[PDB]
Design a binder for this molecule. Structure first.
Ligand SMILES: NC(=O)C1=CN([C@@H]2O[C@H](COP(=O)(O)OP(=O)(O)OC[C@H]3O[C@@H](n4cnc5c(N)ncnc54)[C@H](OP(=O)(O)O)[C@@H]3O)[C@@H](O)[C@H]2O)C=CC1
Ligand code: SF4
Ligand code: SF4
Ligand code: SF4
Ligand SMILES: [Zn+2]
Lengths: 140, 119, 318, 115, 105, 309, 116, 232, 171
């Protein structure tokens, strides 16, 4: 059930958001999988950070991250979003969102393909298929 | 006293309404321009002998022609309403140019350090 | 293990080389000490048990300073693997309640004995074991009885045993010190409705554990982390209800009548208020006369109320 | 003097270097002669350590790699005192005139001979 | 820095180090984080030191040996650029782009 | 901006392929602008229908570039590399249907009473003010001044192609809609005639001092190697001085202001963005409206904030 | 064609007038302190804000040139502008406040011996 | 028409599509389109020189564009003119920004590119300003300025004058320093952010990177000596 | 400047019909219904794939020769143009006389995929792949050393041979 619906909230900062909305394009559709994102951080599950991440943004990003329910994950979409990427040597850029939010699936490269974002999504769902939360209540 | 600088809420071409009487307002603006600039700053300056001569040229072409369209194709500017709009502000430009007297010497010499780029 | 100048540097990734291993650390206290520990360039092996709960300890440092291992105190081999490569090791461990698979025994005695046996088999310098306040060998809170047994076992083998006894702690998301103040639907317990003791702030606990875990000349000493001044009772509830809602509503029930909820507690999905907590409500801080404190390790822990002003202030009326 | 837009405490702490860039001895060609260089020293504890994970060289100097390119040494030093930090200037070194008759291929009575 | 080992990997298909200062010890290589891991993360370089001994020596009865390395199926130029090497003394059979050995005979 | 500062000129093959790529890029930019605009306004179908052939334009980048949308394909010395054959054959068959589908997205927005009160004389910017605001491009030509750069300062073979420029009459957002929707079916003519007039020639610059050598003879020649080596180590020589160059990007006049040292690296580069000027004008335009007016008036003036700084 | 809290840029000539102008700036910058503590929810008290504001202006008591004091006045009034509403956020706002000691552990006692 | 795309009527073409020859791209001229325009534009600059000789400095013409040097204390009377003259009806500004060359004692040249509408002709206008002393803005003349001069102030600390809302846009709100000065480098002074212990307070530190920007410090003999051209 | 009064004779009560009931808007409904019947465009991405041009960029696999002696020569040209400095190389004279890479480092954190590495390595030894085979959970699983890249080239050169043999006469 958690692996099926799986909607994000767009944070969507730059070019990598143009590829994100290309996943909403009809070629590599989100809704053939279930990805129907709301624009609201409480109604969300995972928080795709796409685009580069400024120094100026990062407190707003962590404040969005905190008002988000407990089964939460983060996708770092785009090379700039993880390890700073193509700028990384600015005064005003954050050297990767690992300095801000904990991330569970990275997505490489300036703009990663719509193929790439969906492959990261399926790898995240493959991680979800090993969450084993109920038998971890049983303390396996 | 020419309040036909730009009109209001009529539909001319580009978001600026059509003035009713463009020729008398324009010839009064040229008359006032020639009355202001000629009697303020000397005829020695190139600026007066440029603005004045172009003003008399425009005055000639306006006072000659009749319709609001041949005056366009001779005036070298855009629309005749916009010719009037253009023809407004050089009166106030020369009127300001009474002050900050530009025909004098150059008030500052930079050190020539400032204007060196390469080579 | 030998090192260079001191602890406190002036910049992250000016890394130490100290390879630490912190048990537990997914929950309450182990957040802030590995937050102080990865901040200043130390490799941390933090083992875990739940995959979804270990995530928010990764952002304390950047690279190689947080690592995940799949320990479990049943498995010898997991803990054996966990501290092969370590240099120092702390264990904050032990639920405040039995599970459906764990006794109070063998969550900090033989659970402690396994990991200390791994320490002795690996010759790990600077083993630090936390243990509870009021850690006696007497019965009445078998939690405290078991922590006393755990300190006994950690002193049986491994003379490298810096035992630290913090007081009831005081921080953000206090498990059973302020969550029973903040949410607090009807905080109702304490037959003796007063007569508790020393609170200590959590970042001061973490600073104490940080300033003990690196300096030498403190092997085999035991610490107790006293409250700074006040050693105060449940009257701090009144200061908690100094915030305008005053919803605290202590109803001071009889003792044996209060047991049933705790006997309900074993059946529930989530832990609530298991009866060794109820027995500890009859105790106080049996303060050790001879155990080194914040003044020995050169700290002054912060007071209660002005810090409580910051610490509980989402929960105001207007 | 207070610095207006320099948030560091650079101005009290470090020694900076004004130097003419040296003439390289490997290549012939002399374009580095015609500048003036500002360079902050690495007299540091930060001073480019070694990483342990991949093994880059993560520095700690926030202004390790930085070079002005000025025009004149006195304009350089008027800037250096204007923004106000401790400098040290270094004088360049020229190459001295020596008359080169290509005809240096002739002798009197003398032992040594060359190509 | 302590006592632990996992005997499952030498350097490569070649046994020892590939060059100056390319070690294969793991403890200095931070054995903290190799744990819970397969060792079937990729040791795939076959250490081309071994692959010149794979290669047979080529003979040219001239004096100057051309080397390309380019295939005879590719439509574009893909090998290393045209270095002319000398085969004069025996021993200097080394195209410094490919390591193919050219001896004069 | 750089090749103006090099006193070189790219050959005719390069100018035609950069012009046709500029106009499929113009199709892409106006398409994504109108789609994101209409999604902010509320209709979802024009957004997705437009992205359906934005994916085909993504492929037409991809068969040329190394990725879907970003590209190092233009160089100062012309471009990277000549086209492949099936691309130029396919792009005609694309442009055969793109006019039909552009009409298809056009039929349900341009005519309806929604977009006729959803867009009214809203955000009226007069030409006297629009010139004083530093506006440009689609909003400028929506305010009824028949001026762009392409017909008026013709860079890169827009001189040589029949190109007609739409002109607004009312400075509202509705003519700013319809002027983009006209620029689509003006750019498709450009793709037509650049499919026809495509010459054969060198697609990089002619010499090899300044851009890149050809990779065939860089492995059969001394000089091609030294040019390859220095062109990827030290960049290359640029003569000193200033320049500024503006073209009409589909969001407005983009200017690039470059002060070159006379060395390997630019001593100063300042961009100039319509998304930084139109955003600056936004307060003077937005007054006397409501908030759901303001949502649309963001999307009209092409406020994609990756062109701020 | 607008403001946000009436930021004006016009540097006067005389140092007395600049003195009075910085004085009135100090009054508004001091008066907004309970508004700051309301707006950002700091831990420390309003007198901590006041003694640190006084510290910040005593950092530039002895600056000579009025033509430096101009842009110092602009920086002061401009950061007042960016503090009087919620442009700055509390993570951005704590960059003025070296509040806590316990973050550092034992550290340099400013002796030469303990540089080593 | 019909017969365009899929649901096919079985009619297509990928054949006989060629023009096979050898190229004839006969050209050598770098920059000769501009020379008549440069000769016109010299004379235009001489007009601007003789018309306003007090407030202007030496013009500078280069490759079909024009740059007027202006003494910095007097820019507003220059730009009441030259935006708004009859013969110079520019009325449309396209860039104000700054360039440091920290060579000279005045440090930041401030550069304006303006655009005509009637005349399709750009122009440039420069002043020089120091970090110490301001130069007045041009927001009194039109409204397209007050965003750009914020950008100029933020990137440089070229302080301005006679201007409403001189804020920051282009940096962080607590961030001092000025980036496009060549004083402080790419990394910035304080640029880190982390949030673990003092919770959510994403507070900076000394910015210690993970691999420093290993620069480019190579330079060849000498670029070129310019083949000059002027009308006169 | 078209004056364009346009007072009267647009319609003769037909105007009130088209305004009164939504004929212009029912037209758009009929358009989207006619669009409803036609073909979709989804590509079942685990099972199907979008078009992969040969010049598309990927994950930096190091080629070797036929019987390959590790074709990279650490020539540093692929260092000096990586525009985010995501290249870190170190080299040494290896035992057999030639020069090889001591370490080879790609920050896949900061590889923009400009392909300049591929456009400049003269022996064509670093190559952008077409494979999008990624999505690691750590940065420590992204920082590609020499072994990852040689392994990646050893995993496929078939695809790279297809790529070069459709591209190398254009590169
Ligand atoms: N009233 C109090 O709580 C006081 C605390 N202390 C001591 O401080 C120590 C740390 O406090 P605190 O941070 O709140 O502890 P936590 O609430 O954070 O829990 C400790 C972590 O270790 C895990 N763990 C380790 N071993 C086991 C095991 N056999 N069975 C189940 N879970 C295990 C726990 O669950 P999981 O396996 O799921 O990760 C938990 O995540 C405590 O152990 C206590 O002795 C002392 C004074 C007051
Ligand atoms: S990761 Fe790449 S695509 Fe995304 S913002 Fe950065 S440069 Fe752009
Ligand atoms: S593809 Fe581009 S970013 Fe990546 S290493 Fe090569 S040149 Fe650098
Ligand atoms: S460009 Fe070629 S020779 Fe140079 S480092 Fe890269 S692979 Fe090695
Ligand atoms: Zn070879």
């Amino acid at each position: 059930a958690r692996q099926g619906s799986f909607w994000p909230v767009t944070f969507g900062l730059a070019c990598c958001a143009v590829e994100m909305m290309h996943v909403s394009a009809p070629r590599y559709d989100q809704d053939r999988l279930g990805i129907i994102f709301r624009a609201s951080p409480r109604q969300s599950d995972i928080m795709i950070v796409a685009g580069t991440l400024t120094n100026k943004m990062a407190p707003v990003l962590r404040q969005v991250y905190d008002q988000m329910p407990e089964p939460r994950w983060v996708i770092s979409m785009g090379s700039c979003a993880n390890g700073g990427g193509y700028y990384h040597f600015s005064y005003s850029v954050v050297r990767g969102c690992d300095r801000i939010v904990p991330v569970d699936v990275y997505v490489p490269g300036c703009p990663p393909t719509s193929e790439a974002l969906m492959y990261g999504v399926f790898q995240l769902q493959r991680k979800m298929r090993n969450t084993k939360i109920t038998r971890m209540w049983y303390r396996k | 006293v020419l309040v036909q600088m730009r009109e209001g809420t009529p539909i001319g071409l580009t978001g600026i309404y059509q003035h009713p009487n463009p020729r008398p307002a324009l010839i009064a603006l040229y008359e006032a321009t020639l009355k202001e600039l000629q009697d303020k700053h000397p005829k020695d300056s190139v600026y007066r002998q440029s603005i004045e001569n172009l003003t008399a040229h425009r005055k000639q072409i306006v006072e000659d022609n009749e319709v609001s369209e041949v005056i366009e194709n001779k005036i070298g500017a855009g629309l005749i309403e916009e010719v009037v709009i253009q023809a407004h502000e050089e009166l106030e430009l020369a009127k300001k140019m009474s002050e900050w007297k530009p025909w004098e010497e150059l008030e500052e010499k930079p050190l020539e350090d400032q204007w060196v780029y390469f080579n | 293990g030998k090192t260079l100048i001191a602890k406190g540097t002036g910049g992250r990734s000016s890394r130490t080389g100290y390879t630490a291993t912190v048990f537990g650390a997914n929950g309450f206290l182990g957040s802030y000490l590995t937050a102080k520990l990865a901040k200043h360039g130390t490799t941390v092996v933090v083992p875990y048990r739940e995959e979804m709960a270990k995530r928010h300890l990764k952002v304390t440092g950047d690279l190689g300073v947080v690592n995940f291992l799949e320990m479990d105190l049943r498995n010898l081999e997991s803990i054996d693997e966990a501290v092969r490569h370590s240099d120092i090791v702390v264990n904050l461990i032990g639920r405040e309640y039995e599970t459906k698979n764990f006794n109070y025994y063998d969550v900090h005695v033989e659970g402690a004995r396994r990991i200390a046996e791994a320490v002795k088999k690996h010759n790990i310098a600077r083993y630090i074991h936390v243990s509870a306040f009021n850690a006696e060998i007497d019965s009445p809170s078998e939690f405290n009885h078991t922590k006393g047994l755990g300190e006994q076992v950690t002193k049986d083998i491994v003379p490298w045993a810096t035992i630290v006894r913090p007081a009831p702690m005081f921080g953000r998301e206090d498990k059973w010190f302020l969550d029973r103040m903040a949410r607090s639907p009807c905080l109702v317990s304490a037959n003796k409705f007063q007569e508790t003791s020393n609170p200590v702030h959590v970042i001061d606990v973490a600073a104490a554990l940080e300033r003990i875990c690196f300096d030498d000349s403190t092997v085999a000493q035991t610490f107790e982390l006293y409250g700074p001044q006040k050693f105060t009772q449940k009257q701090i509830i009144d200061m908690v209800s100094e915030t305008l809602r005053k919803e605290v509503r202590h109803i001071e029930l009889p003792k044996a009548l209060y047991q049933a909820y705790t006997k309900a507690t074993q059946a529930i999905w989530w832990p609530t208020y298991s009866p060794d907590q109820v027995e500890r409500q009859f105790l106080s801080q049996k303060i050790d006369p001879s155990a080194k404190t914040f003044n020995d390790l050169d700290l002054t822990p912060m007071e209660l109320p002005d810090l409580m002003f910051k610490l509980i202030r989402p929960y105001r009326v207007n | 003097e207070i610095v207006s837009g320099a948030p560091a405490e650079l101005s009290r702490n470090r020694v900076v270097r004004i130097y003419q860039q040296a003439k390289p001895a490997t290549q012939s060609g002399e374009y580095g002669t015609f500048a003036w260089r500002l360079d902050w020293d690495i007299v540091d504890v930060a001073n480019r350590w070694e990483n342990d994970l991949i093994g880059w060289q993560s520095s700690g100097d926030y202004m390790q790699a930085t070079q002005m390119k000025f025009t004149s040494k006195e304009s350089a030093i008027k800037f250096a005192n204007k923004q106000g930090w401790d400098f040290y200037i270094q004088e360049p070194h020229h190459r001295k005139f020596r008359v080169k008759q290509y005809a240096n291929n002739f002798v009197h009575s003398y032992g040594k001979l060359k190509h | 820095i302590p006592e632990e080992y996992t005997k499952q990997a030498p350097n490569r298909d070649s046994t020892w180090a590939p060059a100056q200062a390319s070690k294969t010890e793991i403890y200095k290589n931070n054995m903290v984080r190799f744990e819970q891991k397969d060792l079937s993360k990729q040791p795939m370089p076959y250490a081309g030191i071994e692959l010149i001994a794979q290669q047979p020596v080529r003979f040219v009865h001239g004096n100057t040996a051309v080397c390309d390395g380019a295939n005879h199926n590719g439509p574009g130029a893909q090998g290393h650029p045209k270095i002319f090497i000398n085969v004069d003394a025996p021993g200097s059979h080394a195209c410094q782009y490919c390591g193919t050995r050219y001896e004069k005979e | 901006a750089v090749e103006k500062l090099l006193n070189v000129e790219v050959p005719l093959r390069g100018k035609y392929i950069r012009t046709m790529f500029g106009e499929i890029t113009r199709v892409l930019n106006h398409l994504m602008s109108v789609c994101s605009h209409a999604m902010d306004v509320g209709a979802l179908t024009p957004f997705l229908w437009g992205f359906e052939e934005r994916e085909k334009l993504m492929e037409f980048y991809e068969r040329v570039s190394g990725a879907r949308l970003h590209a190092a394909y233009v160089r100062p010395g012309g471009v990277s590399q000549d086209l492949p054959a099936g691309l130029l054959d396919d792009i005609y068959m694309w442009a055969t249907q793109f006019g039909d589908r552009l009409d298809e997205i056009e039929e349900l927005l341009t005519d309806n009473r929604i977009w006729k009160l959803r867009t009214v004389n809203i955000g009226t910017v007069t030409a006297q003010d629009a010139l004083n605001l530093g506006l440009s491009g689609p909003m400028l030509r929506g305010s009824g001044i028949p001026f762009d750069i392409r017909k008026n300062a013709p860079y890169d073979a827009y001189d040589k192609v029949d190109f007609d420029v739409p002109v607004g009459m009312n400075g509202d957002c509705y003519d700013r809609y319809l002027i983009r929707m006209a620029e689509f079916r003006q750019s498709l003519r450009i793709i037509e005639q650049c499919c026809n007039d495509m010459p054969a020639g060198a697609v990089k610059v002619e010499d090899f001092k300044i851009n890149s050598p050809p990779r065939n003879l860089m492995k059969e020649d001394m000089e091609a190697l030294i040019h390859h080596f220095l062109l990827y180590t030290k960049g290359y020589s640029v003569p000193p001085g200033e320049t500024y160059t503006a073209i009409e990007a589909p969001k407005g006049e983009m200017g690039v202001y470059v002060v070159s040292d006379g060395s390997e690296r630019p001593y100063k580069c300042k961009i100039r963005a319509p998304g930084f000027a139109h955003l600056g004008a936004f307060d003077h335009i937005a007054r006397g409206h409501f908030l759901p007016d303001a949502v649309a008036i963001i999307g009209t003036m092409d406020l994609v904030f990756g062109e701020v700084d | 064609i607008a403001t946000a809290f009436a930021e004006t840029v016009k540097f006067s000539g005389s140092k007395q007038e600049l003195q009075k102008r910085t004085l009135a700036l100090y009054r508004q910058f001091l008066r907004g302190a309970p508004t700051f503590a309301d707006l950002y929810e700091v831990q420390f008290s309003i007198p901590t804000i006041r003694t640190k504001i006084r510290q910040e202006f005593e950092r530039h008591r002895f600056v000579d040139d009025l033509s430096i004091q101009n842009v110092l006045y602009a920086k002061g009034h401009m950061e007042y502008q960016e503090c009087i509403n919620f442009w700055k956020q509390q993570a951005q706002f704590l960059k003025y406040f070296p509040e806590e000691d316990d973050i550092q552990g034992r550290h340099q006692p400013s002796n030469f011996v303990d540089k080593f | 028409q019909a017969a365009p795309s899929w649901e096919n009527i079985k009619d297509i073409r990928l054949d006989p599509k060629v023009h096979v020859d050898e190229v004839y791209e006969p050209i050598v001229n770098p920059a000769d389109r501009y020379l008549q325009h440069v000769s016109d534009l010299h004379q235009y600059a001489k007009y601007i020189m003789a018309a306003l000789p007090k407030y202007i400095q030496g013009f500078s013409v280069w490759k079909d564009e024009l740059t007027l040097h202006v003494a910095p204390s007097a820019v507003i009377p220059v730009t009441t003119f030259l935006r708004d003259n009859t013969s110079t009806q520019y009325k449309s500004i396209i860039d104000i920004t700054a360039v440091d060359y920290p060579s000279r004692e005045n440090r930041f040249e401030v550069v304006y590119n303006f655009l005509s509408v009637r005349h399709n002709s750009r122009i440039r206008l420069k002043t020089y300003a120091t970090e110490v002393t301001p130069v007045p803005s041009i927001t009194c003349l039109y409204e397209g300025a007050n965003w750009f001069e914020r950008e100029a102030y933020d990137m440089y600390g070229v302080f301005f004058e006679g201007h409403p809302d001189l804020r920051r846009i282009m940096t962080d709100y607590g961030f001092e320093g000025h980036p496009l000065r060549k004083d402080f480098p790419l990394t910035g002074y304080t640029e880190v952010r982390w949030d673990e212990e003092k919770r959510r307070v994403v507070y900076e530190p000394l910015e210690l990177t993970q691999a420093f920007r290993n620069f480019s410090a190579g330079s060849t003999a000498w670029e070129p000596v310019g083949p000059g051209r002027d009308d006169r | 400047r078209p004056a364009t009064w346009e007072e009267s004779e647009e319609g003769a009560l037909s105007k009130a019909t088209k305004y009164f009931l939504l004929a212009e808007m029912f037209r758009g409904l009929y358009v989207v219904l006619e669009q409803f019947f036609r073909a979709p465009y989804t590509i079942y991405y685990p099972f199907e794939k979008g078009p992969v041009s040969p010049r598309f960029r990927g994950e930096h696999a190091l080629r070797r020769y036929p019987s390959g002696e590790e074709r990279c020569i650490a020539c540093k040209l692929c260092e000096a143009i990586c525009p985010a400095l995501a290249i870190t190389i170190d080299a040494e004279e290896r035992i057999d006389g030639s020069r090889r890479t001591t370490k080879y480092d790609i920050d896949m954190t900061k590889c923009i995929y400009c392909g300049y590495c591929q456009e400049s390595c003269p022996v064509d030894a670093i190559v952008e792949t077409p494979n999008v085979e990624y999505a690691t959970e750590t940065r420590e699983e992204l920082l590609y050393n020499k072994e990852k890249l040689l392994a990646n080239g050893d995993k496929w050169e078939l695809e790279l041979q297809y790529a070069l043999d459709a591209d190398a006469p254009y590169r």
